[model samples]
Target: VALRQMSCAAGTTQTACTDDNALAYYNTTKGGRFVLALLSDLQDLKWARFPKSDGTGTIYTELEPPCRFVTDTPKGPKVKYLYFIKGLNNLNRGMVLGSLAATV
Candidate 1:
């Protein structure tokens, strides 16, 4: 797919997720398919006025376990989607059999 160039540096200690970390790394180089909005509040179906770290524009973000969102549009609003990155689910052990067993 043709798209604008975007990414985190290999030199980054960690990737974009937590809002602060996101603003930090992305403030350097940003956006993405796995634009993992990893704020603690976002994890619990809460929302935040996500930063203009990438200097794009205003973004009101909502997130959850299965994850979703609604955001700004001068012409009404827009429904945007982001892919889930399984590798970084920290406290949540996920839906696998072993994951459940360990948590239990």
Candidate 2:
């Protein structure tokens, strides 16, 4: 697995924008479909192959942030971290997962 950093939108605090919070925001927002589509695409690519113990795989590029989501809240507008993973074990057959550590 590989790790990367993501940022909240400008002027937004990390305390107010968390992983669960961002997910909830996406689910109810108009951009919900967009978020789901990106995740689906990534997941599909991860499952394109059959069962395997280990093999070479690349999940994202280092040139750009492969994932991003934004939300408008009562406190303020919050931007979720742009996230991606490379060299991951997609064969695990789980959620299309990655880390979004605080990079504020």
Candidate 3:
């Protein structure tokens, strides 16, 4: 397998870090590595605003849905937005946001 998985449940000296109210992104493009990097390193992502302009218009308060981020991978990047129930597996007929959507 190209990738491997493990958990601290079997490791005696390992401790897993976690957050209580953080967003849990799954099945994101490019494995979603850049999303955290951009939100963190890009600005600490504690607040929302535009860095390109200094005017009040530069700041964003009423942000809406469809979260936008980059897939910044080795090949390049794409401006894809967050989506729900893609056309592939684990869709609405298979899974939910964090729970299974359903089946038959």
Candidate 4:
């Protein structure tokens, strides 16, 4: 079974899974798949608005694990989906893993 909970961004870390945004990451054996979800909270003006004008970008957690999100562009604020797993090899080792762009 896979368990999911909202992640609270805390401390000085500039990551999304912190107190800045809500994060959900987990692995399921029954489905044999990795799951991740991120939501912008109203507290943070950035996420509450979503999609910066710079164009949607990718967020890296540690290395292999990665999350992708896009801003509203000229709309105003932005929310990014920073979530992912570092593949079976990295997860098996219990590493927090990092995030990388899907294209690169």
Candidate 5:
């Protein structure tokens, strides 16, 4: 005989911290530690800017597919955005069963 199991639950919690910034992020994994560091040189490197510019130009928005973020390990400093199902799992094992695409 084959055995099957399913479970579902919902909960919430609140905590306080002492960061002067009001930004928030979600750690979407159960077995990983999520830590965010404030970037000090982003603007200086021209990779990012403060008080974003506003000018008349061709602006484009496109639907980006649902994706997964794969990190080097469950707990570490390396992280990146992965856009395809291949990025989520081993390419030799299987394929993405279903997907939905959208833009932010």
Candidate 6:
């Protein structure tokens, strides 16, 4: 299925998942998706909290694998999905980030 935005349950927080590289990238970019199957060694899924650009409360959220999609790319057969969590904080504000693509 194509990548789609999904909602996290109420009360969800950064304490939910372990630390992971893919997740870190997602956080750095604010929001995004990734192809988990393509990751060589998925690591801890942790949170990287920081003050919002507006200097409001810190934005806290765990890397969440919510959806995935398969598509052909010049690189080769590829799969991707939203690598970040949804509806989690003042920054993300329930918006889905970019997609992480990887070859099969």
- Candidate 1, clashing residue pairs? none
On lDDT, who's better, 2 or 5? 2
Steric collisions counted per model: 0, 0, 2, 23, 0, 16
Q: How well is each residue in 9-100 modelled by candidate 2, as lDDT tens digits?
A: 21123222222212211112344211111121121121111112255532222112345455566887765543222343343212333222
How much is the lDDT of residue 90 in candidate 4? 47
Q: Return the TM-score for each candidate structure.
A: 0.25, 0.23, 0.19, 0.28, 0.19, 0.30
- Residue 78 deviation, candidate 4, in Å? 0.9
Question: Which of 1 and 3 is the better model by lDDT?
Answer: 1
Model 2: pairs clashing at backbone N, Cα or C within 3 Å: none
lDDT of 3 at 9: 14
The lowest-lDDT stretch of 10 consecutive residues in candidate 5 is: 41-50
Stretches off by above 4 angstroms in model 6 are 1-51, 55-58, 83-104
Estimate candidate 1's alpha-carbon lDDT, on a 0 to 1 scale.
0.32
lDDT by candidate, in order shown: 0.32, 0.26, 0.25, 0.37, 0.21, 0.37
Model 2 Cα displacement at 79 (Å)?
Answer: 1.6
Q: Could you give the candidate ranking by lDDT, starting with the highest?
A: 6, 4, 1, 2, 3, 5
RMSD of 4: 13.1
Residue-by-residue lDDT tens digits, candidate 5, 24-46: 12123466422111112011111
Compose the digit string of candidate 6's lDDT tens values, residues 1-104. Answer: 23342222212245542333332332332354431221212233334343345777555554454445566768876654434433355334232333333223
32-90 per-residue lDDT for model 1 (tens digits): 43333332212233332343668885454443343445655588765443222334364
TM-score: model 5 vs. ground truth: 0.19
Instruction: Please give the range of 10 consecutive residues that has the lowest summed lDDT in model 1.
Output: 20-29
